[PDB]
Design a protein around this ligand. Structure first.
Ligand SMILES: [Mg+2]
Ligand SMILES: [Mg+2]
Ligand SMILES: [Mg+2]
Ligand SMILES: [Mg+2]
Ligand SMILES: [Mg+2]
Ligand SMILES: [Mg+2]
Ligand SMILES: [Mg+2]
Ligand SMILES: [Mg+2]
Ligand SMILES: [Mg+2]
Ligand SMILES: [Mg+2]
Ligand SMILES: [Mg+2]
Ligand SMILES: [Mg+2]
Ligand SMILES: [Mg+2]
Ligand SMILES: [Mg+2]
Ligand SMILES: [Mg+2]
Ligand SMILES: [Mg+2]
Ligand SMILES: [Mg+2]
Ligand SMILES: [Mg+2]
Ligand SMILES: [Mg+2]
Ligand SMILES: [Mg+2]
Ligand SMILES: [Mg+2]
Ligand SMILES: [Mg+2]
Ligand SMILES: [Mg+2]
Ligand SMILES: [Mg+2]
Ligand SMILES: [Mg+2]
Ligand SMILES: [Mg+2]
Ligand SMILES: [Mg+2]
Ligand SMILES: [Mg+2]
Ligand SMILES: [Mg+2]
Ligand SMILES: [Mg+2]
Ligand SMILES: [Mg+2]
Ligand SMILES: [Mg+2]
Ligand SMILES: [Mg+2]
Ligand SMILES: [Mg+2]
Ligand SMILES: [Mg+2]
Ligand SMILES: [Mg+2]
Ligand SMILES: [Mg+2]
Ligand SMILES: [Mg+2]
Ligand SMILES: [Mg+2]
Ligand SMILES: [Mg+2]
Ligand SMILES: [Mg+2]
Ligand SMILES: [Mg+2]
Ligand SMILES: [Mg+2]
Ligand SMILES: [Mg+2]
Ligand SMILES: [Mg+2]
Ligand SMILES: [Mg+2]
Ligand SMILES: [Mg+2]
Ligand SMILES: [Mg+2]
Ligand SMILES: [Mg+2]
Ligand SMILES: [Mg+2]
Ligand SMILES: [Mg+2]
Ligand SMILES: [Mg+2]
Lengths: 211, 296, 121, 169, 58, 159
RNA sequence: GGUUGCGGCCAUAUCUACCAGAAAGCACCGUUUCCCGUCCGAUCAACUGUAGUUAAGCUGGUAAGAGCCUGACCGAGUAGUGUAGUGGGUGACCAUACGCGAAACUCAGGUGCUGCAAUCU
RNA sequence: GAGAACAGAAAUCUCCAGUAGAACAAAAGGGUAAAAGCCCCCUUGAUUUUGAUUUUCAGUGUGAAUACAAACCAUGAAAGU
RNA sequence: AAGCUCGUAUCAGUUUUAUGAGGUAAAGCGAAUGAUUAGAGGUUCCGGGGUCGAAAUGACCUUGACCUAUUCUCAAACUUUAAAUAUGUAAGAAGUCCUUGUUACUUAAUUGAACGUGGACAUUUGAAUGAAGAGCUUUUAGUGGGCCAUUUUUGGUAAGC
C-alpha cells in the first residue's frame, strides 16, 4: 500500500511540514540519526567520509531508515560498533500527500502519506567519522547504502577533522596550541572575544608560549 | 543580579528601548503629544505651554513652544527670584507658587506689548475668573498648563501657579475644582479660603497656631521667620507688597555672575574623567594576560 | 546604452568606421523632409534643412555624425533609417539569434560591425 | 561607606488566611482591626479550588500593612511568641523576613468567645532610606546594589538589635 | 458544464489599443472637498479684492 | 469562499518596523502641510483612524486640503485604460513631505545662480543635465605596477 | 565644561559588574496645623528649607563584558535573478551569453549627538 | 525566583526579576506598556442636520469606513478627546 | 463610422537622473516563534525509583525533567536581514524669486492661510530617444464557450488532465 517511491521522487510541491495546519501526519520511519561510538572525542576520529547528493530530489523516511540500517550493519560487522560514528545528516520534514480512493477528482486534497527529506545537489546525506585505518571499510559502508537511494550520490573523502569544521592541519595548529577544549563529542574553541576573566577559567592550557 | 535572572543575548538583542526622556521618568509623551500638536490649518502657530514644575523647593515657571529641533522658552520665572520682590522664606508654598506664576504672567505680557492692556485682577479677592478679551483689541496671550507628572488634586499648588498666571493677565483656560476650598459636596467654591492660600493664610495661621501649643517645633521650623522677626500677621502684607512690587517691575534681572563661562569650563574638566584610547586598552589586556596567565 | 542593452537579442551593432558611415550616407542616405523620405544626392537638399545648424553638405552631414557633434540629434534624425539588404555573402554564422560571442549574430560585435554593414549595403 | 544606608523597617504586613467568607472572616478582620488600629483589607479568592472550598472573588481572607513605630511594637510582641528564635529561611534573599504564629491571643489581646482564635502570618519588609526612588511617580529608578537589602545584612541586623537567635543551617 | 473561471489574458492588449490615457492636468483645479470654513471666508476674500480691483479702475 | 476586506492581504504591510513600535515620535506632528505640497503615503498601523487603503501605500500625491488633524491628498488611480482622480482624507501620521522634488528644487536655485553668475560674466553656460558620458582616453602607468597574471583554477572540494 | 526645567533624534542612549564625582543643582531627607488621598502621610497632598546625607538617585569612568551602531574587493561577484539559444542531459537538473546582485560569515572602529532657557568654582 | 501559622501541586501575604512571553466578546492577522491591557471616577457623541471621500465599482447601488462643515452635549485643571 | 477644435504642439506598453513603496527568491535558526539529532556541564527543602537508614528540609547513587555553553536538521500559512523583475512621484512659463492688497477664516499680534495687484530672469527654458502630429465629442457592430508555448504556479501518482 506504500506507493512506489517513484511517485514522489521530484520536489514538485512546496514544503508541507507537520504543523498546526497539518497535524494528522504519520511518524518518520527513520528515527535514530547518530549510530556508532557517538560519545567519542573529536581527537579520536580524524577521518570523515561523506555521502553526497548529486541531485535535487526527495528521500523517503523509509529509504533513509533502510539505508541507515544497511551501512551501520556493515560498518559494525567489519569494524565493531565502536570503530565509527555514523551521522545521518538529513531529516525527513516534508509531508507527502495521497488521494486515497462515490466520486473521482472533485476536491482531491491528499492525506499525509509518508515523509521525505528534500535534498539539494552537493547536500551531504550521511557523514561518518573514524580513524584513517578504517577508510576502505567506512567507504564500503556508504557504497552499500547508496543502493538504498534513488538519484545519483557521490562519496567524498573530506578535508576536515571529523565532524569538525576545520581541515586537519588547521585543527592541529589550534589544538597543539591552546585553543581547543573537549565537549560532549565536539569541541569548544578559545575566543579572542569577550571577558578576559572567564576566558582563562576555561582553557587554562592556553596562555603559554612554547610546549 | 541573581544568577537565574540575568539577561541573555536575545532579551537584550530584541529590546526596544523607550524614548530617553521616558527612561528618565521625566516626560509623559501621551500628554505631550496632546499638549503640543496644533490644528493643521493653523499652520506655524505655536502652541504655548505654561510649564510648572516643583523642585525640592524652588518653583519653575516657563512658557514654552515646540520646534522639531527642540522646544523654545519664551520666558522663565523661578520662585527663587522672589527675594527680589520681598519674599525670602517659604518658596515652595502655595502663595509663592501664586507669586511666581503672577511674575511669569507680568514678565511675558510685558515683553509682548499687552503689558499695559491686560492687567488681570489687581485686587485679588480669590474670585473665580480668567482674563477677558478687550472690545476691539488684541486677544490676550493664550497659554496651556503643562503640569507634567503632578497629580491633579484639589488643593494642589501646581494650580496656585496657574491662578497667578491667570490673575496676571494671561488667558489660561481653567476650572475651580482644584483650587483650595472647593466643595466636594457642592459644586461650589468658598473664595474666603482660596484668597487665604494666595496670601498664605494657611502658613501664617499655622504659625500663630504653633506660637502657643508647642514652641520647640515652632522654632525647629519657622526658625527663619524668627531670626528675621516676622511673626505671622505681617505675612499677608509680605505677599501683598510682593504683588505690588512684581507688577511694578517684572522685567527679570540675570545673575551678576562672576567667573566667566570659560572659567566654569575650567574647574570642571578637573573633575571629569577621560575616555581611554584603544591602544591603551590593549596594553591593559596584554598587561593582564601577562599577570593572570603566566602563573603570577 | 541601457536601450541597446534591452534589444541585444534582436539587433547587431558595433563601432562604425569613417569608411562605412561615408558609404552609408553616399549610397543609401535619405532625409526626412515633411516626412517624405527624400534622397540626398544634391547638397542643396541638405543645407535646406540641416543648414540651420551649420552643415550644408553630404560631407558636413557625415562629419557631424562621426564626430558626434553638438548637433547630432538633429543631424542623425534628419537621416531616414537606413534600409539595407541582407549581408551579401551570408552571416558567417549558422544560427543568427545568439550573441556574437557565442558564435551567432546579435550583440555588440564592435569594429566587426563594418565588415557586415558593408556586405548588406 | 556607611552614614544612613542604615536599616529601617519598611512595613509590617500581617495576614490571616481564612478558608472562607462570612462570620469567620469578619471575626478575623476584627482581630487585625484592634491590633493594627487601621481598618484592614479583604482579599478575594483568585480562582476556584472546590477542595479548598472557595469560589473566585469569594472574599476569603484579611490583612493589614502597618508602618512606623506601630510596626515595631507588633513585630516585637510576636517576636515574643517566637521567643526570638527564627530560622535561616524566613529571611528572603531580597532582605525581608516573616514568621508564623497561631493563636493571636498569644500577644497582648484577651480572648472573647465571640471572636474566637486565629493564626497569623507576620511579614516584615525591610529597606534603607531613599527607597522612595523605586516608588515615587517621577524619575522612578532603582536602588544601587551597594544599598539593596541583602539577606545576610538583614539577618545580622535582626540578630544584633533584638538580641534574638536565627538557629538552623 | 464547467467552463473557464477567470483570466487577465489579453487585457493590457486592450487597454493599450486606445490608451492608458495620461491623467490630464488642469491649472485651477476644483475646490471640491475643500474645508467649507475655509471656502466660506475665501469667497468673501475674493469678493473683497475683486471690489478693490474694480475701484482700481475709476 | 473568498475574502476581500478593507485591509485584507495587508499583514506585513501595516506592520510596524522592527524595534520601532510604540508612540509615534512627536516630530510626525510638528511637521506642517500646505496645499500643493507633494506627500508620500505610507500607513502607520498603530494609528487606526484615518489610515489610507492598502492600494495607496507607497503612493505619492498632492495636498488639496488641510483640516484639523488631516490633509486631503489627491492621487491619480488608474482603472481600465485611464486615470481617475481620488481624494484621500489622510491623518498626518500616514503622510510625509516628499523628497521627490527637492533635487529639482535644489537644481533650480542652483541653475538660476550659475546663470546669473554666467550672465554677469560673459554668457557661456550649458546647464541641462546630460547623462553619463563614455569616458575619455587615458594612460595607465606601470611605475609600481606590473600586471599580475592569473589563470583559472583546478577543481577542488573542502568538505 | 557641570547642573536643572522643557526638548529633538529615540540603545554609539540599553544590559551586567565594579570605581570616581569638586562646586552649584537635583536628590534623598524633616513635619502633619491646613487643602488633599490612603488598609498604611510608602505613593499621593500640604508645611519647613529648618534638623540631616552623598548611601542611593543622578553624572562619569573601567570591561580581550552582553547588546547595539558604523565600515570593508571578509565572505561573494557567491546565492538568488531579468534577458538569449533547434545549448547539454532519459530525466532530475546543469552549463554558457548580455546584465542586476544579496544574507550569514569574518575582521576593524565605535559606545549618545544635540536645541531653548536658567544656573555654577 | 526567594520568602510567611493551619496551607498540601494549587487558597491569602511580601519582595525581586519580567519587550509584553498577558489581556483587549469572538476567527485570524495587524496594533497597544505612565496604553489600546487592570482598578476607579464622571457619563450618553450609540445624539442632531445635510453634503464630500475610501474599499468593492459600471468608478451604479448596498454594507462598512475616513476627514470636515453646522448644532447640542460628555468628560478633563487643561491641551484635548 | 462621422467628424470637430487645434497644431509643433502636446504626445510615449522606452531609457536616464532624483526621491519613495514592497517582504517574494535567496538567506537565518549557537536571532523571536515553531519543528528536530546528539552528547557535555549544571540545579532541586521540590517527579519517581534504590543503598544506608528511627527520621531528617539526611548523605550517597539513579533516571527524568528544567538551566548553561555547545551540536546535526527544517517552515505556504516562521523570521531579524533582504534582492532581481515589476511599481508611485518629480525632471519648470501652470516656472523661481521680490514688492504688499483682500477676508467674515486664523493669530497674542495685518500674525497666518488662501486669491490677487506691481516688478526682476527666455529657449542649454533646464535629462535621453522617438513622434506620418495632439486633443476632444457623438453614435453603433460583432464578442461576452476560447485554446496553445516558454517562464512563475495550485490540486492530482499521473495525464494530449
Ligand atoms: Mg520547479
Ligand atoms: Mg503540485
Ligand atoms: Mg460519478
Ligand atoms: Mg480518486
Ligand atoms: Mg477538506
Ligand atoms: Mg543511488
Ligand atoms: Mg557552525
Ligand atoms: Mg534566563
Ligand atoms: Mg552569543
Ligand atoms: Mg495626564
Ligand atoms: Mg562580397
Ligand atoms: Mg565570394
Ligand atoms: Mg552567393
Ligand atoms: Mg543549421
Ligand atoms: Mg550590396
Ligand atoms: Mg553617607
Ligand atoms: Mg476553610
Ligand atoms: Mg453549465
Ligand atoms: Mg474543460
Ligand atoms: Mg466564461
Ligand atoms: Mg482566502
Ligand atoms: Mg462577487
Ligand atoms: Mg515600548
Ligand atoms: Mg472607531
Ligand atoms: Mg553638595
Ligand atoms: Mg489627617
Ligand atoms: Mg514622608
Ligand atoms: Mg507631595
Ligand atoms: Mg558613591
Ligand atoms: Mg533625577
Ligand atoms: Mg562589546
Ligand atoms: Mg536567471
Ligand atoms: Mg532550454
Ligand atoms: Mg549553481
Ligand atoms: Mg487579535
Ligand atoms: Mg501616559
Ligand atoms: Mg446605534
Ligand atoms: Mg442599481
Ligand atoms: Mg452607496
Ligand atoms: Mg505575501
Ligand atoms: Mg525560502
Ligand atoms: Mg539571513
Ligand atoms: Mg533552503
Ligand atoms: Mg529557531
Ligand atoms: Mg516565506
Ligand atoms: Mg518605471
Ligand atoms: Mg524627432
Ligand atoms: Mg507630423
Ligand atoms: Mg461599442
Ligand atoms: Mg453585449
Ligand atoms: Mg455563446
Ligand atoms: Mg510562442
Amino acid at each position: 500500500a506504500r506507493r512506489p517511491a517513484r511517485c514522489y521522487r521530484y520536489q514538485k510541491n512546496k514544503p508541507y511540514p507537520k504543523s498546526r495546519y497539518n497535524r494528522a501526519v504519520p511518524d518518520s520511519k527513520i528515527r535514530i540519526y547518530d549510530l556508532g561510538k557517538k560519545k567519542a572525542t573529536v581527537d579520536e576520529f580524524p577521518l570523515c567520509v561523506h555521502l553526497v547528493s548529486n541531485e535535487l530530489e526527495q528521500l523517503s523516511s523509509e529509504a533513509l531508515e533502510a539505508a541507515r540500517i544497511c551501512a551501520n550493519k556493515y560498518m559494525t560487522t567489519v569494524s565493531g560498533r565502536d570503530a565509527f560514528h555514523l551521522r545521518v545528516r538529513v531529516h525527513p520534514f516534508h509531508v507527502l500527500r495521497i488521494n486515497k480512493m462515490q466520486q473521482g477528482m472533485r476536491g482531491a486534497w491528499g492525506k499525509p502519506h509518508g515523509l521525505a527529506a528534500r535534498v539539494d545537489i552537493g547536500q551531504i546525506i550521511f557523514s561518518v567519522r573514524t580513524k584513517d585505518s578504517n577508510k576502505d571499510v567506512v567507504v564500503e559502508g556508504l557504497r552499500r547504502a547508496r543502493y538504498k537511494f534513488p538519484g545519483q550520490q557521490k562519496i567524498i573523502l573530506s578535508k576536515k577533522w571529523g565532524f569538525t569544521n576545520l581541515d586537519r592541519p588547521e585543527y592541529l595548529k589550534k589544538r597543539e596550541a591552546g585553543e581547543v577544549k573537549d565537549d560532549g563529542a565536539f569541541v569548544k574553541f578559545l575566543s579572542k572575544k569577550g571577558s578576559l576573566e572567564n576566558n582563562i577559567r576555561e582553557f587554562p592550557e592556553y596562555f603559554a608560549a612554547q610546549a | 543580579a541573581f544568577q537565574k535572572d540575568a539577561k541573555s543575548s536575545a532579551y537584550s538583542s530584541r529590546f526596544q528601548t523607550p524614548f530617553r526622556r521616558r527612561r528618565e521618568g521625566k516626560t509623559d509623551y501621551y500628554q505631550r503629544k496632546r499638549l503640543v500638536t496644533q490644528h493643521k490649518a493653523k499652520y506655524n502657530t505655536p502652541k504655548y505651554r505654561l510649564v510648572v514644575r516643583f523642585t525640592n523647593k524652588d518653583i519653575i515657571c516657563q512658557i514654552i513652544s515646540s520646534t522639531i529641533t527642540g522646544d523654545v522658552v519664551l520666558a522663565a520665572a523661578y520662585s527663587h527670584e522672589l527675594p527680589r520682590y520681598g519674599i525670602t522664606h517659604g518658596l515652595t508654598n502655595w502663595a509663592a507658587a501664586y507669586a511666581t506664576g503672577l511674575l511669569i504672567a507680568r514678565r511675558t505680557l510685558q515683553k509682548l506689548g499687552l503689558d499695559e492692556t491686560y492687567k488681570g485682577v489687581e485686587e485679588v479677592e480669590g474670585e473665580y475668573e480668567l482674563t477677558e478679551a478687550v472690545e476691539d483689541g488684541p486677544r490676550p496671550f493664550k497659554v496651556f498648563l503643562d503640569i507634567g507628572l503632578q497629580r491633579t488634586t484639589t488643593g494642589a499648588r501646581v494650580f496656585g501657579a496657574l491662578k497667578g498666571a491667570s490673575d496676571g493677565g494671561l488667558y489660561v483656560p481653567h476650572s475651580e475644582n482644584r483650587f483650595p476650598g472647593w466643595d466636594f459636596e457642592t459644586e461650589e467654591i468658598d473664595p474666603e479660603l482660596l484668597r487665604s492660600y494666595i496670601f498664605g493664610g494657611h502658613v501664617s495661621q499655622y504659625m500663630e497656631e504653633l506660637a502657643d501649643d508647642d514652641e520647640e517645633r515652632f522654632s525647629e521650623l519657622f526658625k527663619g521667620y524668627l531670626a528675621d522677626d516676622i511673626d505671622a500677621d505681617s505675612l499677608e502684607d509680605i505677599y501683598t507688597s510682593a504683588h505690588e512690587a512684581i507688577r511694578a517691575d517684572p522685567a527679570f534681572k540675570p545673575t551678576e555672575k562672576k567667573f566667566t563661562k570659560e572659567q566654569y569650563a575650567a574647574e570642571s574638566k578637573k573633575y571629569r574623567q577621560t575616555k581611554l584610547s584603544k591602544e591603551e586598552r590593549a596594553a591593559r589586556v596584554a598587561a593582564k594576560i601577562a599577570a593572570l596567565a603566566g602563573q603570577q | 546604452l541601457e536601450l541597446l542593452k534591452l534589444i541585444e537579442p534582436y539587433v547587431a551593432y558595433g563601432y562604425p568606421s569613417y569608411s562605412t558611415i561615408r558609404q552609408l550616407v553616399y549610397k543609401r542616405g535619405f532625409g526626412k523632409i515633411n516626412k517624405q523620405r527624400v534622397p540626398l544626392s544634391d547638397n542643396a537638399i541638405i543645407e535646406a534643412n540641416l543648414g540651420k545648424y551649420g552643415i550644408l553638405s553630404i560631407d558636413d552631414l557625415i562629419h557631424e555624425i562621426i564626430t558626434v557633434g553638438p548637433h547630432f540629434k538633429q543631424a542623425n534624425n534628419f537621416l531616414w533609417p537606413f534600409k539595407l539588404s541582407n549581408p551579401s555573402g551570408g552571416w558567417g554564422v549558422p544560427r543568427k539569434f545568439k550573441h556574437f560571442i557565442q558564435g551567432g549574430s546579435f550583440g555588440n560585435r564592435e569594429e566587426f560591425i563594418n565588415k557586415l554593414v558593408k556586405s548588406m549595403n | 561607606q556607611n552614614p544612613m544606608r542604615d536599616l529601617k523597617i519598611e512595613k509590617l504586613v500581617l495576614n490571616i488566611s481564612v478558608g472562607e467568607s462570612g462570620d469567620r472572616l469578619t471575626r478575623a478582620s476584627k482581630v487585625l482591626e484592634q491590633l493594627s488600629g487601621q481598618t484592614p483589607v479583604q482579599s478575594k479568592a483568585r480562582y476556584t479550588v472546590r477542595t479548598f472550598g472557595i469560589r473566585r472573588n469569594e472574599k476569603i481572607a484579611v490583612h493589614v500593612t502597618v508602618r512606623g513605630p506601630k510596626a515595631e511594637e507588633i513585630l516585637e510582641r510576636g517576636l515574643k511568641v517566637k521567643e526570638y528564635q527564627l530560622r535561616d529561611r524566613n529571611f528572603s534573599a531580597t532582605g525581608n523576613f516573616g514568621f508564623g504564629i497561631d493563636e493571636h491571643i498569644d500577644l497582648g489581646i484577651k480572648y472573647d468567645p465571640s471572636i474566637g482564635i486565629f493564626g497569623m502570618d507576620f511579614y516584615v519588609v525591610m529597606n534603607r532610606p531613599g527607597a522612595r526612588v523605586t516608588r515615587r511617580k517621577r524619575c522612578k529608578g532603582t536602588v544601587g546594589n551597594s544599598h539593596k537589602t541583602t539577606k545576610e545584612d538583614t539577618v545580622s541586623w535582626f540578630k544584633q538589635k533584638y538580641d534574638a537567635d536565627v538557629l538552623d543551617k | 458544464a464547467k467552463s473557464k473561471n477567470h483570466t487577465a489574458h489579453n487585457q493590457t492588449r486592450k487597454a493599450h489599443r486606445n490608451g492608458i490615457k495620461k491623467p490630464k492636468t488642469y491649472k485651477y483645479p476644483s475646490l471640491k472637498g475643500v474645508d467649507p470654513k475655509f471656502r466660506r471666508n475665501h469667497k468673501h476674500a475674493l469678493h473683497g479684492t475683486a471690489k478693490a480691483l474694480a475701484a482700481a479702475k475709476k | 469562499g473568498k475574502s476581500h476586506g478593507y485591509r485584507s492581504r495587508t499583514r506585513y504591510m501595516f506592520q510596524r518596523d522592527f524595534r520601532k513600535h510604540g508612540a509615534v515620535h512627536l516630530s510626525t506632528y510638528l511637521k506642517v502641510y500646505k496645499v500643493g505640497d507633494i506627500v508620500d503615503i505610507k500607513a502607520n498601523g498603530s494609528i487606526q483612524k484615518g489610515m489610507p487603503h492598502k492600494f495607496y501605500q507607497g503612493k505619492t500625491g498632492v495636498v488639496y486640503n488641510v483640516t484639523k488633524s488631516s490633509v486631503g491628498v489627491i492621487i491619480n488611480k488608474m482603472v481600465g485604460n485611464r486615470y481617475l482622480e481620488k481624494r484621500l482624507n489622510l491623518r498626518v501620521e500616514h503622510i510625509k513631505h516628499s523628497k521627490c522634488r527637492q533635487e529639482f528644487l535644489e537644481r533650480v536655485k542652483a541653475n538660476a545662480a550659475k546663470r546669473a553668475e554666467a550672465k554677469a560674466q560673459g554668457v557661456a553656460v550649458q546647464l541641462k543635465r546630460q547623462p553619463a558620458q563614455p569616458r575619455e582616453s587615458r594612460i595607465v602607468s606601470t611605475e609600481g605596477n606590473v600586471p599580475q597574471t592569473l589563470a583559472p583554477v583546478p577543481y577542488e572540494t573542502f568538505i
